[PDB]
Design a protein around this ligand. Structure first.
Ligand SMILES: Cc1cc2nc3c(=O)[nH]c(=O)nc-3n(C[C@H](O)[C@H](O)[C@H](O)COP(=O)(O)OP(=O)(O)OC[C@H]3O[C@@H](n4cnc5c(N)ncnc54)[C@H](O)[C@@H]3O)c2cc1C
Ligand SMILES: [Ca+2]
Ligand SMILES: [Ca+2]
Ligand SMILES: [Cl-]
Length: 244
């Protein structure tokens, strides 16, 4: 299967550390509908070698284009660097879409949590939740300026954790979450963030409040000190340890 060549239509700052690139062009023909929160693979040139791949979320989808929001993280990679320099009319090949994972809607209350890499996906889950949904969304951003006014059910509270430097100990997100009252009934939990933060969260829930995996999604989206290729190995190893 060959990749799609897509065209950069627009580049837009959402917040100082979040840049939205809009992709379109003839290359999107037959791309499937209803893919918001699904992920794609951006393909990047290597001289004399296989292309690098970087994973991103479809933040928004219209019938003629899709939006991808790039966190402008420290220590540029091929992807964040590409986003910052991307001109209108420039081309990029992608693979995808890969299947989306939404939070389990079949629950009494909800908890979504993650860092900026998960913010696009969390924003789609919040917009899709029922109007009367109850619970919490806890999101780690780099500054106050990177807080966004998201659409959400009025009884889902948005808690922002502001942290300029990612914590290899994984403390910020779990420490805020453990201060949030546990509500009545069974929750569904959706968590995606930096590996160590997700493991801290996962460990918290195992020790304190054990939940079935159907109602408890965890995912490492990146890892400190690793590029995506290195992260993938650690992710796979962790998945294998955890699921057997
Ligand atoms: C399912 C899925 C969906 C994702 N969706 C998005 C999305 O929509 N938007 C988005 O921005 N990211 C998203 N990510 C995370 C993204 O794939 C990684 O951030 C990726 O490493 C960025 O690629 P890069 O080329 O810029 O950096 P890389 O070449 O992979 O790494 C370069 C350096 O930057 C560090 N690094 C990578 N990401 C971050 C970060 N965000 N903060 C601080 N340091 C970082 C690495 O540890 C490494 O040291 C998603 C990840 C997954 C698995
Ligand atoms: Ca509440
Ligand atoms: Ca708890
Ligand atoms: Cl664990």
């Amino acid at each position: 299967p060959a990749p799609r060549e897509l065209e950069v239509i627009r580049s837009t700052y959402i917040t100082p550390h979040m840049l939205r690139i809009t992709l379109g062009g003839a290359g999107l023909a037959g791309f499937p509908a209803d893919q918001e929160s699904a992920y794609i693979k951006l393909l990047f040139p290597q001289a004399g070698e296989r292309p690098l791949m970087r994973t991103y979320t479809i933040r928004q989808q219209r019938d003629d284009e899709i939006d991808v929001d790039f966190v402008l993280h420290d220590t540029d990679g091929p992807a964040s660097s590409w986003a910052k320099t991307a001109q209108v009319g420039e081309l990029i090949q992608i693979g995808g879409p890969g299947l989306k994972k939404l939070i389990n809607f079949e629950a009494d209350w909800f908890l979504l949590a993650g860092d900026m890499t998960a913010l696009p996906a969390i924003s789609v889950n919040l917009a899709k939740l029922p109007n009367n949904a109850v619970g919490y969304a806890v999101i780690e951003v780099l500054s106050e300026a990177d807080i966004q006014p998201l659409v959400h059910p009025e009884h889902v509270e948005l808690h922002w954790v502001i942290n300029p430097e990612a914590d290899p100990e994984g403390r910020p997100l779990v420490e805020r979450i453990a201060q949030l009252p546990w509500l009545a009934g069974e929750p569904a939990v959706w968590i995606a963030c930096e590996f160590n933060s997700m493991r801290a969260l996962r460990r918290h829930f195992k020790q304190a409040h054990a939940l079935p995996k159907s109602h408890f999604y965890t995912s490492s989206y990146w890892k400190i000190g690793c590029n995506e290729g290195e992260h993938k190995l650690v992710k796979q190893e962790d998945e294998q340890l955890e699921n057997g």
